[PDB]
Coordinates of C-alpha atoms in Angstrom, one line a residue:
Chain A
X210 CA -50.2 -96.9 18.4
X211 CA -48.5 -93.7 20.1
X212 CA -46.9 -94.4 23.2
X213 CA -46.9 -91.1 25.4
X214 CA -44.3 -91.3 28.3
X215 CA -44.1 -89.3 31.6
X216 CA -42.2 -89.7 34.8
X217 CA -44.0 -92.7 36.4
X218 CA -46.9 -92.7 33.9
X219 CA -47.8 -94.3 30.3
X220 CA -50.5 -93.1 28.3
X221 CA -51.0 -95.7 25.2
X222 CA -52.9 -93.9 22.7
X223 CA -54.6 -96.8 20.2
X224 CA -57.2 -97.0 17.3
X225 CA -58.6 -99.0 15.0
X226 CA -58.6 -98.6 11.1
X227 CA -61.7 -96.5 11.4
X228 CA -59.8 -94.2 14.1
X229 CA -62.0 -95.5 17.0
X230 CA -61.4 -97.5 20.0
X231 CA -64.0 -99.8 21.5
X232 CA -64.2 -100.8 25.1
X233 CA -63.5 -104.1 24.2
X234 CA -60.6 -103.6 22.2
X235 CA -59.3 -101.6 25.1
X236 CA -59.9 -104.2 27.3
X237 CA -58.2 -106.8 25.1
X238 CA -55.1 -104.5 24.4
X239 CA -54.7 -104.0 28.4
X240 CA -54.8 -107.7 28.8
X241 CA -52.0 -108.1 26.2
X242 CA -50.4 -105.3 27.6
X243 CA -50.1 -107.3 31.0
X244 CA -47.5 -109.4 30.1
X245 CA -45.6 -106.5 28.5
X246 CA -46.1 -103.3 30.3
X247 CA -43.0 -102.6 33.2
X248 CA -44.0 -103.6 36.8
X249 CA -45.1 -100.8 39.3
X250 CA -45.5 -97.9 36.7
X251 CA -49.3 -96.6 36.1
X252 CA -50.5 -97.4 32.6
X253 CA -53.6 -96.3 30.6
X254 CA -55.4 -97.1 27.5
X255 CA -57.3 -94.4 25.5
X256 CA -58.5 -93.7 22.1
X257 CA -56.7 -91.1 20.0
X258 CA -58.0 -87.6 19.4
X259 CA -60.0 -88.4 15.9
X260 CA -61.1 -85.5 13.9
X261 CA -63.5 -85.9 11.2
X262 CA -63.6 -83.9 8.4
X263 CA -66.4 -82.8 5.8
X264 CA -65.5 -82.3 2.2
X265 CA -67.5 -80.3 -0.4
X266 CA -65.8 -80.0 -3.6
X267 CA -66.9 -78.1 -6.7
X268 CA -65.1 -79.4 -9.8
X269 CA -65.6 -78.2 -13.4
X270 CA -65.0 -80.6 -16.3
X271 CA -63.7 -79.4 -19.8
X272 CA -65.5 -82.4 -21.6
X273 CA -69.2 -81.7 -20.3
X274 CA -70.6 -85.1 -21.8
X275 CA -68.5 -87.1 -19.3
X276 CA -70.6 -85.4 -16.5
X277 CA -72.6 -88.1 -14.5
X278 CA -72.9 -90.1 -11.4
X279 CA -69.8 -92.1 -12.3
Chain B
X103 CA -20.0 -101.4 27.9
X104 CA -21.0 -102.8 24.6
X105 CA -21.7 -99.6 22.8
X106 CA -18.6 -98.3 24.2
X107 CA -15.3 -99.9 23.1
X108 CA -13.9 -101.6 26.6
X109 CA -15.7 -103.0 29.7
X110 CA -13.3 -102.4 32.5
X111 CA -14.7 -98.7 32.6
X112 CA -16.8 -97.8 35.9
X113 CA -20.4 -97.6 35.1
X114 CA -23.3 -97.7 38.0
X115 CA -27.1 -96.4 38.3
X116 CA -28.0 -94.4 40.8
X117 CA -31.4 -94.8 42.1
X118 CA -32.7 -91.6 44.4
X119 CA -35.6 -92.8 45.8
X120 CA -33.6 -95.1 48.1
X121 CA -32.6 -91.5 49.6
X122 CA -36.2 -90.4 50.4
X123 CA -36.5 -88.9 53.7
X124 CA -38.7 -91.2 55.8
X125 CA -39.8 -89.7 59.2
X126 CA -38.3 -92.4 61.5
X127 CA -35.7 -94.4 59.6
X128 CA -33.8 -91.5 58.0
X129 CA -31.0 -89.7 59.8
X130 CA -32.1 -85.8 60.1
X131 CA -28.7 -84.5 59.1
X132 CA -28.1 -87.7 57.0
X133 CA -27.7 -88.6 53.3
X134 CA -31.3 -88.5 52.7
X135 CA -33.3 -85.8 51.3
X136 CA -36.7 -84.5 51.3
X137 CA -39.3 -86.0 48.5
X138 CA -39.8 -84.2 45.6
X139 CA -39.0 -84.0 41.6
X140 CA -35.7 -85.4 41.5
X141 CA -35.5 -87.5 44.5
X142 CA -38.8 -89.6 43.1
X143 CA -39.8 -93.1 42.0
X144 CA -39.1 -93.8 38.3
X145 CA -36.2 -91.9 38.2
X146 CA -32.5 -93.1 37.8
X147 CA -29.3 -90.9 37.1
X148 CA -26.4 -93.4 35.1
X149 CA -22.7 -92.3 36.0
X150 CA -20.3 -92.9 33.4
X151 CA -16.3 -92.8 33.7
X152 CA -15.5 -92.8 30.1
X153 CA -16.0 -90.1 27.2
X154 CA -19.4 -91.2 25.4
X155 CA -21.4 -89.8 22.5
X156 CA -24.8 -88.0 23.1
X157 CA -26.4 -90.8 21.1
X158 CA -25.6 -93.1 23.9
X159 CA -28.5 -91.6 25.6
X160 CA -30.9 -92.9 22.9
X161 CA -29.0 -96.0 23.3
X162 CA -30.4 -96.1 26.8
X163 CA -33.8 -95.1 25.7
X164 CA -33.7 -98.2 23.8
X165 CA -33.2 -100.8 26.5
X166 CA -34.7 -98.3 29.8
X167 CA -38.1 -99.2 31.0
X168 CA -40.9 -97.2 29.6
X169 CA -42.0 -94.5 32.0
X170 CA -38.8 -93.8 33.8
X171 CA -36.9 -90.2 33.5
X172 CA -33.5 -90.3 32.5
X173 CA -30.0 -88.7 33.6
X174 CA -26.7 -88.8 32.7
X175 CA -23.4 -88.1 34.8
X176 CA -20.0 -87.8 33.5
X177 CA -17.5 -88.5 35.7
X178 CA -14.2 -86.6 34.7
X179 CA -12.0 -88.1 37.4
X180 CA -11.9 -91.8 35.5
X181 CA -10.8 -90.1 32.3
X182 CA -7.6 -88.0 33.7
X183 CA -4.3 -89.1 32.1
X184 CA -2.4 -90.8 34.8
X185 CA -2.6 -90.3 38.5
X186 CA -5.1 -87.4 39.0
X187 CA -3.3 -86.6 42.5
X188 CA -1.8 -83.0 41.5
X189 CA 1.5 -81.9 43.8
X190 CA 3.0 -78.7 44.9
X191 CA 5.9 -79.7 46.8
Chain C
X4 CA -48.4 -66.3 47.8
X5 CA -47.1 -69.7 49.6
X6 CA -49.5 -71.9 48.0
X7 CA -47.1 -72.0 44.9
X8 CA -45.0 -74.7 43.4
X9 CA -41.7 -73.5 45.3
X10 CA -43.5 -74.1 48.9
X11 CA -46.9 -75.7 48.3
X12 CA -48.3 -74.5 51.4
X13 CA -51.4 -76.2 52.2
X14 CA -52.8 -74.0 55.0
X15 CA -56.4 -72.5 54.7
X16 CA -58.2 -70.8 57.5
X17 CA -61.7 -71.8 56.0
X18 CA -60.9 -75.9 56.9
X19 CA -60.8 -75.7 60.5
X20 CA -57.8 -78.0 60.6
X21 CA -55.7 -77.1 63.6
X22 CA -53.0 -80.2 63.8
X23 CA -50.8 -81.9 61.6
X24 CA -50.8 -85.6 62.8
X25 CA -47.4 -87.3 61.6
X26 CA -47.5 -91.1 61.2
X27 CA -44.4 -93.2 61.4
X28 CA -42.5 -95.0 58.6
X29 CA -43.9 -92.5 55.6
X30 CA -42.2 -89.9 53.3
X31 CA -42.2 -86.4 55.0
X32 CA -43.5 -83.6 52.8
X33 CA -42.1 -80.3 53.4
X34 CA -46.1 -79.1 52.7
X35 CA -47.1 -80.3 56.4
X36 CA -44.0 -78.6 57.9
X37 CA -45.0 -75.3 56.4
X38 CA -48.7 -75.7 57.2
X39 CA -47.6 -76.8 61.0
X40 CA -45.9 -73.3 61.4
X41 CA -48.7 -71.3 59.3
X42 CA -51.4 -72.9 62.0
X43 CA -50.1 -71.4 65.1
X44 CA -48.9 -68.2 63.6
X45 CA -52.5 -67.8 62.6
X46 CA -54.0 -68.4 65.6
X47 CA -51.7 -66.1 67.2
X48 CA -52.5 -63.4 65.0
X49 CA -56.2 -64.1 65.9
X50 CA -55.6 -63.7 69.6
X51 CA -53.4 -60.5 69.0
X52 CA -56.4 -59.1 66.7
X53 CA -59.0 -59.9 69.4
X54 CA -57.3 -57.0 71.5
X55 CA -54.9 -54.9 69.6
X56 CA -55.0 -52.8 66.5
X57 CA -52.4 -52.5 63.9
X58 CA -51.4 -48.6 65.2
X59 CA -51.1 -49.4 68.6
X60 CA -48.0 -48.3 70.0
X61 CA -46.8 -50.4 73.3
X62 CA -43.5 -48.8 74.4
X63 CA -41.1 -46.4 73.2
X64 CA -41.4 -44.7 69.4
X65 CA -40.9 -41.2 70.8
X66 CA -40.6 -39.1 67.5
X67 CA -37.8 -36.4 66.7
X68 CA -38.8 -33.3 64.5
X69 CA -35.9 -30.8 63.3
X70 CA -36.4 -27.7 62.0
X71 CA -36.6 -28.8 58.2
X72 CA -39.8 -31.0 59.3
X73 CA -37.4 -34.4 59.1
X74 CA -39.0 -36.9 61.1
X75 CA -37.2 -39.9 62.9
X76 CA -38.7 -42.5 65.3
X77 CA -36.8 -44.2 68.1
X78 CA -36.9 -47.9 68.6
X79 CA -40.0 -49.4 70.2
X80 CA -42.6 -52.0 70.0
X81 CA -45.8 -52.0 67.9
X82 CA -48.7 -54.5 66.9
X83 CA -48.6 -54.8 63.1
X84 CA -50.3 -57.7 61.3
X85 CA -50.7 -60.4 63.9
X86 CA -47.6 -60.1 65.9
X87 CA -46.2 -57.5 68.3
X88 CA -43.0 -56.3 66.3
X89 CA -39.8 -54.4 67.8
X90 CA -39.0 -51.4 65.5
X91 CA -35.6 -50.5 65.1
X92 CA -35.0 -49.0 62.2
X93 CA -33.5 -45.3 61.5
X94 CA -35.7 -43.8 59.0
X95 CA -35.6 -40.1 58.1
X96 CA -38.5 -39.4 56.0
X97 CA -40.0 -35.9 55.8
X98 CA -43.2 -34.3 55.9
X99 CA -44.7 -31.2 54.0
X100 CA -45.7 -29.4 57.3
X101 CA -49.0 -28.3 55.7
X102 CA -52.2 -29.9 56.1
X103 CA -53.3 -33.3 57.6
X104 CA -50.4 -35.7 57.8
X105 CA -50.0 -39.1 59.1
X106 CA -47.2 -41.2 59.7
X107 CA -47.5 -44.8 59.3
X108 CA -45.5 -48.3 58.9
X109 CA -45.3 -50.4 56.3
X110 CA -44.3 -54.2 56.4
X111 CA -42.5 -55.8 53.1
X112 CA -42.4 -59.5 52.7
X113 CA -39.2 -60.8 51.3
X114 CA -37.5 -64.1 50.5
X115 CA -34.1 -65.0 52.2
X116 CA -32.4 -68.0 50.5
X117 CA -29.0 -69.5 51.0
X118 CA -27.7 -67.9 47.8
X119 CA -28.5 -64.6 48.9
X120 CA -27.0 -65.6 52.8
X121 CA -24.5 -67.9 53.0
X122 CA -25.4 -68.7 56.5
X123 CA -28.4 -70.5 55.9
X124 CA -26.3 -73.5 54.5
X125 CA -26.1 -76.4 57.0
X126 CA -22.7 -75.9 59.2
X127 CA -23.1 -78.9 61.2
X128 CA -19.7 -80.3 61.4
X129 CA -18.9 -83.9 59.8
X130 CA -22.4 -85.0 58.2
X131 CA -23.0 -85.8 54.6
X132 CA -25.5 -82.6 54.4
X133 CA -22.5 -80.2 55.3
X134 CA -22.7 -76.8 53.3
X135 CA -26.1 -78.2 51.6
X136 CA -28.6 -75.7 50.7
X137 CA -32.0 -75.9 52.9
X138 CA -35.0 -74.0 53.8
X139 CA -35.5 -70.3 52.8
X140 CA -36.7 -67.6 55.5
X141 CA -39.4 -64.9 55.1
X142 CA -37.6 -61.6 56.3
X143 CA -40.6 -59.1 57.2
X144 CA -39.0 -55.6 57.8
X145 CA -40.5 -52.2 58.8
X146 CA -40.2 -48.7 57.4
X147 CA -42.1 -45.4 58.0
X148 CA -44.5 -44.0 55.3
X149 CA -46.2 -40.7 55.0
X150 CA -50.0 -40.3 53.9
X151 CA -49.8 -44.0 52.9
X152 CA -53.4 -45.5 53.7
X153 CA -51.9 -49.1 53.3
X154 CA -49.6 -48.3 56.2
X155 CA -50.8 -48.6 59.8
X156 CA -51.1 -44.7 61.2
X157 CA -48.9 -44.5 64.8
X158 CA -49.1 -40.5 64.5
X159 CA -51.0 -37.8 63.1
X160 CA -49.7 -34.0 62.7
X161 CA -51.9 -31.3 61.6
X162 CA -49.7 -28.2 60.1
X163 CA -46.6 -29.7 61.6
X164 CA -48.1 -30.0 65.1
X165 CA -48.6 -33.3 66.9
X166 CA -52.6 -33.7 67.0
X167 CA -53.0 -36.8 69.7
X168 CA -50.9 -38.0 72.4
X169 CA -50.9 -41.3 73.9
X170 CA -48.5 -41.5 77.1
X171 CA -49.0 -45.4 77.6
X172 CA -49.8 -48.4 75.7
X173 CA -52.5 -48.3 73.0
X174 CA -55.2 -51.1 73.5
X175 CA -58.2 -50.6 71.2
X176 CA -60.6 -53.5 72.3
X177 CA -59.9 -52.5 75.8
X178 CA -60.2 -49.0 75.2
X179 CA -63.6 -49.5 73.8
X180 CA -65.0 -51.4 76.8
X181 CA -63.5 -48.9 79.0
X182 CA -65.4 -45.9 77.1
Chain D
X123 CA -53.6 -84.1 51.5
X124 CA -51.4 -86.3 49.3
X125 CA -48.1 -85.8 47.9
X126 CA -48.4 -82.6 45.8
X127 CA -45.2 -83.0 44.2
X128 CA -46.2 -86.4 42.6
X129 CA -50.2 -85.7 42.3
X130 CA -51.1 -89.0 41.8
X131 CA -51.5 -92.2 44.4
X132 CA -48.6 -94.2 45.1
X133 CA -46.8 -96.0 47.8
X134 CA -45.0 -92.6 48.7
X135 CA -48.0 -90.3 48.4
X136 CA -49.8 -90.7 51.7
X137 CA -48.3 -88.5 54.9
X138 CA -49.5 -87.1 58.1
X139 CA -53.1 -87.0 58.7
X140 CA -55.2 -83.5 59.9
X141 CA -57.3 -83.0 63.0
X142 CA -60.5 -81.0 62.0
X143 CA -62.6 -79.1 64.6
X144 CA -66.0 -78.1 63.3
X145 CA -68.3 -76.2 65.3
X146 CA -71.9 -76.9 65.8
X147 CA -74.8 -75.0 67.5
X148 CA -76.5 -76.5 70.3
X149 CA -79.7 -75.5 72.6
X150 CA -79.5 -76.6 76.4
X151 CA -76.0 -78.9 76.2
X152 CA -74.2 -77.9 79.3
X153 CA -71.0 -79.1 77.8
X154 CA -71.0 -76.7 75.3
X155 CA -69.8 -73.0 75.8
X156 CA -72.5 -70.7 76.3
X157 CA -73.2 -67.6 73.9
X158 CA -76.7 -66.2 74.4
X159 CA -79.3 -66.8 77.2
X160 CA -83.2 -66.6 76.5
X161 CA -86.1 -66.6 78.8
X162 CA -89.6 -67.4 76.8
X163 CA -88.3 -66.8 73.6
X164 CA -86.7 -63.1 74.8
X165 CA -83.1 -62.1 75.0
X166 CA -82.0 -62.2 78.6
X167 CA -78.6 -60.1 78.7
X168 CA -76.8 -58.1 75.9
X169 CA -73.1 -57.5 75.3
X170 CA -72.5 -54.4 72.5
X171 CA -69.1 -55.0 72.4
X172 CA -66.1 -57.9 73.2
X173 CA -66.7 -59.8 76.3
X174 CA -63.6 -60.5 78.6
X175 CA -64.2 -62.6 82.0
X176 CA -61.0 -62.0 83.6
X177 CA -61.0 -58.1 82.5
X178 CA -64.4 -57.6 83.7
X179 CA -63.8 -59.0 86.8
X180 CA -61.0 -56.8 87.5
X181 CA -62.9 -53.8 86.5
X182 CA -65.6 -54.8 88.3
Chain E
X4 CA -56.4 -89.4 72.7
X5 CA -52.9 -88.6 71.1
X6 CA -50.9 -90.5 73.3
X7 CA -52.2 -93.8 71.3
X8 CA -50.7 -96.2 69.4
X9 CA -50.6 -94.1 65.8
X10 CA -48.8 -90.8 67.2
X11 CA -47.6 -91.6 70.8
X12 CA -47.6 -87.5 71.4
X13 CA -45.5 -87.8 74.7
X14 CA -47.0 -84.1 75.7
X15 CA -48.1 -83.9 79.3
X16 CA -48.4 -80.7 81.3
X17 CA -47.1 -82.0 84.4
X18 CA -43.7 -82.5 83.2
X19 CA -42.9 -78.6 82.6
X20 CA -41.1 -79.6 79.4
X21 CA -41.3 -76.5 77.1
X22 CA -38.9 -77.1 74.1
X23 CA -37.8 -79.9 71.5
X24 CA -34.3 -80.4 71.0
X25 CA -33.4 -81.9 68.2
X26 CA -29.6 -83.1 67.6
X27 CA -28.0 -84.0 64.5
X28 CA -27.7 -87.5 62.9
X29 CA -30.7 -89.2 64.9
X30 CA -34.0 -90.3 63.7
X31 CA -36.9 -87.6 63.7
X32 CA -39.7 -89.1 65.8
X33 CA -43.2 -88.2 64.5
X34 CA -44.0 -88.2 68.0
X35 CA -41.3 -85.4 68.6
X36 CA -43.3 -83.5 65.8
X37 CA -46.3 -83.6 67.4
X38 CA -45.4 -82.9 71.0
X39 CA -43.5 -80.0 69.3
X40 CA -46.7 -78.2 68.1
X41 CA -48.9 -79.4 71.5
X42 CA -46.5 -77.4 73.4
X43 CA -47.0 -74.2 71.9
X44 CA -51.0 -74.8 71.4
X45 CA -51.0 -75.5 75.2
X46 CA -49.4 -72.3 76.0
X47 CA -51.4 -70.4 73.6
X48 CA -54.6 -72.0 75.2
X49 CA -53.4 -71.1 78.9
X50 CA -52.6 -67.3 77.3
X51 CA -56.3 -67.1 76.0
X52 CA -57.9 -68.8 79.4
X53 CA -55.9 -65.9 81.3
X54 CA -57.9 -63.2 79.6
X55 CA -61.2 -65.2 78.1
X56 CA -63.7 -67.6 79.2
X57 CA -65.4 -70.0 76.8
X58 CA -68.0 -68.6 74.9
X59 CA -67.0 -65.1 75.0
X60 CA -68.0 -63.2 71.8
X61 CA -66.0 -60.9 70.2
Chain F
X4 CA -27.7 -70.2 74.9
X5 CA -28.6 -73.0 71.7
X6 CA -26.3 -71.4 68.9
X7 CA -23.7 -73.5 70.0
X8 CA -22.3 -76.7 68.1
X9 CA -24.9 -79.6 69.6
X10 CA -27.8 -77.5 68.4
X11 CA -26.9 -74.5 66.2
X12 CA -30.3 -72.9 66.8
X13 CA -30.0 -70.0 64.5
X14 CA -32.8 -68.0 65.5
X15 CA -32.1 -64.2 66.1
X16 CA -34.5 -61.5 66.5
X17 CA -32.7 -58.5 65.2
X18 CA -33.1 -60.7 62.0
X19 CA -36.6 -59.9 61.8
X20 CA -37.0 -63.5 60.2
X21 CA -40.5 -65.0 61.0
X22 CA -41.0 -68.3 59.0
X23 CA -38.7 -71.3 58.1
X24 CA -39.8 -72.1 54.2
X25 CA -38.7 -75.8 53.5
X26 CA -38.1 -76.5 49.7
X27 CA -38.2 -80.0 48.3
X28 CA -35.4 -82.1 47.3
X29 CA -33.1 -80.8 50.1
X30 CA -31.8 -82.3 53.4
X31 CA -33.5 -81.4 56.4
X32 CA -31.6 -79.7 59.1
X33 CA -32.2 -79.9 63.0
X34 CA -31.3 -76.1 63.2
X35 CA -34.5 -75.2 61.1
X36 CA -36.9 -77.2 63.4
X37 CA -35.3 -75.6 66.3
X38 CA -35.8 -72.2 64.8
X39 CA -39.3 -73.0 63.8
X40 CA -40.3 -73.4 67.4
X41 CA -38.0 -70.7 68.7
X42 CA -39.7 -67.9 66.6
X43 CA -43.4 -68.8 67.7
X44 CA -42.0 -68.8 71.4
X45 CA -40.3 -65.7 71.0
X46 CA -43.5 -64.0 69.5
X47 CA -45.8 -65.7 72.4
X48 CA -43.2 -64.1 75.0
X49 CA -43.7 -60.6 73.3
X50 CA -47.5 -60.9 73.2
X51 CA -47.4 -61.8 76.9
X52 CA -44.6 -59.1 77.9
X53 CA -47.3 -56.3 76.4
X54 CA -50.0 -57.6 78.6
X55 CA -48.4 -59.0 81.8
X56 CA -45.5 -58.6 83.8
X57 CA -43.2 -61.3 85.4
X58 CA -44.6 -62.5 88.8
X59 CA -48.3 -61.1 88.0
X60 CA -50.6 -63.7 90.0
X61 CA -53.4 -64.9 88.0
Chain G
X123 CA -37.5 -90.2 75.3
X124 CA -36.4 -93.3 73.0
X125 CA -38.7 -94.1 70.0
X126 CA -41.1 -96.9 71.3
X127 CA -43.0 -97.2 68.3
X128 CA -43.4 -100.8 67.5
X129 CA -41.8 -102.5 64.4
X130 CA -39.6 -99.4 63.1
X131 CA -36.2 -99.5 62.0
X132 CA -35.7 -96.5 64.5
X133 CA -36.9 -98.5 67.9
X134 CA -35.3 -97.8 70.9
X135 CA -33.0 -94.8 68.8
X136 CA -31.9 -91.9 70.9
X137 CA -33.6 -88.8 69.5
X138 CA -34.1 -85.0 70.7
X139 CA -33.6 -84.1 73.9
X140 CA -36.0 -81.9 76.3
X141 CA -35.5 -78.4 77.6
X142 CA -37.0 -78.9 81.3
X143 CA -37.9 -75.7 83.3
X144 CA -38.9 -76.2 87.0
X145 CA -39.9 -73.3 88.8
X146 CA -38.7 -73.2 92.7
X147 CA -39.6 -70.9 95.6
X148 CA -36.5 -68.2 96.7
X149 CA -36.7 -65.8 99.5
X150 CA -35.2 -62.4 99.0
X151 CA -33.6 -63.4 95.4
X152 CA -33.5 -60.2 92.8
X153 CA -33.4 -62.6 89.9
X154 CA -36.7 -64.2 90.7
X155 CA -39.9 -63.0 89.9
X156 CA -41.5 -61.7 92.8
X157 CA -45.0 -63.0 94.0
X158 CA -45.5 -61.8 97.8
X159 CA -43.8 -59.3 100.1
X160 CA -43.5 -59.4 103.8
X161 CA -43.0 -57.0 106.5
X162 CA -41.9 -58.4 109.7
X163 CA -43.9 -61.5 108.7
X164 CA -47.1 -59.8 107.7
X165 CA -48.4 -59.6 104.3
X166 CA -47.8 -56.4 102.7
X167 CA -50.0 -56.1 99.5
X168 CA -53.2 -58.2 98.5
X169 CA -54.5 -58.8 95.2
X170 CA -58.0 -60.2 94.9
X171 CA -58.0 -61.1 91.1
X172 CA -55.6 -61.3 88.1
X173 CA -52.8 -58.8 88.1
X174 CA -52.3 -57.1 84.6
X175 CA -49.4 -54.5 85.1
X176 CA -50.1 -52.8 81.4
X177 CA -53.8 -52.8 82.1
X178 CA -53.2 -51.4 85.6
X179 CA -51.2 -48.5 84.1
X180 CA -54.2 -47.7 81.9
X181 CA -56.8 -47.9 84.6
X182 CA -54.9 -46.1 87.0
Chain H
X210 CA -44.8 -117.0 45.0
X211 CA -47.4 -114.3 44.8
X212 CA -46.8 -110.7 43.6
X213 CA -48.8 -107.9 44.5
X214 CA -48.2 -104.6 42.4
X215 CA -48.7 -101.1 43.3
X216 CA -47.5 -97.7 41.7
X217 CA -43.8 -97.4 42.3
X218 CA -43.8 -100.2 44.7
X219 CA -43.6 -104.1 44.1
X220 CA -43.9 -106.9 47.3
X221 CA -43.3 -110.4 46.9
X222 CA -44.6 -112.9 49.2
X223 CA -42.6 -116.2 49.2
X224 CA -42.7 -119.4 51.4
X225 CA -41.5 -122.6 51.8
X226 CA -42.9 -126.0 52.5
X227 CA -43.6 -125.2 56.2
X228 CA -45.1 -121.6 55.1
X229 CA -42.3 -120.1 56.7
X230 CA -39.7 -117.9 55.1
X231 CA -36.3 -118.0 56.5
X232 CA -34.0 -115.0 56.8
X233 CA -31.3 -116.7 54.6
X234 CA -33.8 -117.4 52.1
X235 CA -35.3 -113.9 51.9
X236 CA -31.7 -112.6 51.4
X237 CA -31.1 -115.2 48.6
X238 CA -34.9 -113.9 47.2
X239 CA -33.4 -110.0 47.1
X240 CA -30.3 -111.2 45.5
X241 CA -31.6 -113.1 43.0
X242 CA -34.4 -110.4 42.2
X243 CA -31.6 -107.5 41.8
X244 CA -31.6 -108.8 38.3
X245 CA -35.3 -109.2 37.7
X246 CA -36.6 -105.8 38.9
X247 CA -37.4 -103.0 36.9
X248 CA -35.2 -99.8 37.1
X249 CA -36.4 -96.7 39.3
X250 CA -38.9 -99.1 41.0
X251 CA -38.9 -100.3 44.8
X252 CA -38.7 -103.9 45.6
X253 CA -39.8 -105.7 48.7
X254 CA -39.7 -109.1 50.0
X255 CA -42.2 -110.5 52.8
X256 CA -43.3 -113.7 54.3
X257 CA -46.6 -115.2 53.4
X258 CA -49.4 -114.4 56.2
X259 CA -49.5 -118.0 57.6
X260 CA -52.7 -119.0 59.3
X261 CA -52.1 -122.0 61.9
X262 CA -55.6 -123.8 62.2
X263 CA -56.3 -125.4 65.5
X264 CA -59.0 -128.3 65.3
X265 CA -60.0 -130.6 68.0
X266 CA -62.3 -133.2 66.7
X267 CA -64.5 -135.6 68.5
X268 CA -65.0 -138.8 66.2
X269 CA -67.7 -141.2 66.7
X270 CA -66.4 -144.7 66.3
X271 CA -68.5 -148.0 65.9
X272 CA -65.9 -150.8 66.6
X273 CA -65.1 -150.1 70.5
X274 CA -62.7 -152.5 70.7
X275 CA -60.5 -151.2 68.1
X276 CA -60.0 -147.7 69.9
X277 CA -56.5 -147.1 70.8
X278 CA -53.7 -144.7 70.6
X279 CA -52.5 -145.7 67.2

């Protein structure tokens, strides 16, 4: 969780292990935060700015018999 | 008062949103100011009548509620050696 | 532009909104105050524009020309930019004295703050707001220009000779009907 | 119309109201300010330039 | 109907009152603010009516 | 004369100041309000004088 | 002129004064704005419609 | 007690056994809640919106001899 703070506004960036934030989990976080959040200050829950990286690597092997699926 | 070594020092928290200029109740040339960035809710100004390290601000960050802007005022009158009134005659 | 951060003037002619209706026990906004004066000045400008033109002389403004073609204009009234303004500046602009030459007045907007002019500070005796800063002031001064198409022409010269006279007040819209 | 300095809805955001005066076009409403008159779909009277009732009364 | 409860504008032409003179260290009534612009708009209306008629095209 | 202590009306035609621009986080002065309407009334007076004369029946 | 808004803290509190400008009739007062002139109890000049001095100069 | 939350303001509705809120009790509540309210947030105390219901009932009874004031 990353709590981003402004004057009179709170933004709670939260994510799961996969980097997503489902609506059910967002509602559960909000319900949990009802007890902890300060009264009279706006609060909002949003998912992190997840970035998905695709990797294609060419690797050369000294012992060419070790080549295979493993 | 815990972070500092003494309790007798004068400390108070000012809430500027109490002095927002309302149309009716606020006196025209009175103490109130027009609403804006500083005279705004979720803002506090802490007056400290004693020398403090800058890390005291971080200490307040541990205690203040999330979403409130913090300001610190150093009152140099409280720290004057002896009586602060200066004499000419 | 007064729509920016320091003033946040919310007035816009297209919205056809002609009155700010204040309510009790609410926090007063400086933008509402700015718009309150903006509306009245806008409609006054409309009323003026429905009659006068920006180069219309009402009274005074008798010009004096030296042998060195140095021009000075006496004080007088003139309609410029939605208001009838009293000209009282001692300009000494000169003309080349050849070809068509036009004399005009240019209006420059400037901001006056308490820092520049200390008199704007609150001087109400015996109150908490004594000597506190407050509202700024929009200063609009007039100065002569020569062969400036942006300025509002008041006189026209041809080879140093006055081209057209106007003994009495000029009223463009009225003059069109009368013509 | 809310407070522009804050820019969000709040207890302090609300302020003064505005009076809006929109103009609409009518056909035969006597209360409205007449601008044109027609007879059998044909224009009745023209005015090439600005109209000024008091001024025209003086000039007449 | 700006004499109503929310605004309470005290403007009335019969009173012949032309200016609101604010004083220091007093409440700033919203009715006073409304009357401040109502006076100016009324006198501008009078000035316009002294020349123009309703529906005069420009 | 409204330039005195009880009102402090700061309007002056010679200064060529035509708009009172309020700023946030400042106290509100009664003199600013008085000048706010004084400017408009002065310019309305100029507009009327440019057309009409005192005592002109309508 | 006292605040008559129900249920406010400034109720019945004093506020801004008012500038009252009452017009009155005068005779042979040079400071007053003349509206009529008489000679031996007889009207001197008439004006059937609105008077406009600056317009009247141009028209003359 | 009912706490109603708004951005930048808190209002507390309180009542006694009779549904009233005395001025002294209001001041006591305010003084107690000075310690509780968040910094930089406005708190207000008001009385519950009491609604006195007037009931006029016509009761049909079997035993006409037992009709009486008691």
